Design an enzyme around this catalytic site. Sequence first.
Site: not given
Length: 229
Positions: A30, A45
């Site tokens: 990420y 997310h």
Amino acid sequence: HHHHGSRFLIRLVAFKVPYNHQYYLQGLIYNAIKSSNPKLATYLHEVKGPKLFTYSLFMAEKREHPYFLGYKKGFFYFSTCVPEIAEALVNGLLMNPEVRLWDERFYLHEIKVLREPKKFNGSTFVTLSPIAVTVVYDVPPMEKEFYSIIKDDLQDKYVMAYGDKPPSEFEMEVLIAKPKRFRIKPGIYQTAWHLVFRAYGNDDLLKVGYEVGFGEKNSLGFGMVKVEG
RNA sequence: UUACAAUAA
């Protein structure tokens, strides 16, 4: 088209690695997606549910077990059917690190772009990352329904990707099956399965599981498998 | 590119 898909092998450069290490791999992934596409990163997310990408475990060029050992380089694989998830993990891992995981330093070597075997039906699959399927514990392969879940998820993942009516022929037969339990933070039991299996069905159906994964946690590093040939 | 994981809810 769409359907072409993508798979990556990334290579980094005596070092150490833990087990239960896939929450820390959630970090390097990420990090480089935000560092390329910051809207894409945050999106993923809160935007929730099975994501269309998955990635392997962190392996080495050798495995040693008194955490464990390390040696000449080390690596892992990543597959996604969403072009930008990949472009932002290629771009963000490029203009960036310098990668350092846990605290171990490392230096980016190459990103090798693998190929998609056009062979799927019947081919052998071995788990690169284990497999979890959860319901309310985590159902194992001796379980009759481990198969209805794993199938269904793929049928959805199919149209999720293909925007079309899901292919209905899927069976999988499992040769070697290995148990294990992981720590996803802080407090959880994920009983996953290292697997080797034969799978026959719609070609494109299994194409997907190949790319995105098999089972649930695809975004945590479960459900990625390899073809033997 | 390794049928490659130590732990067991």
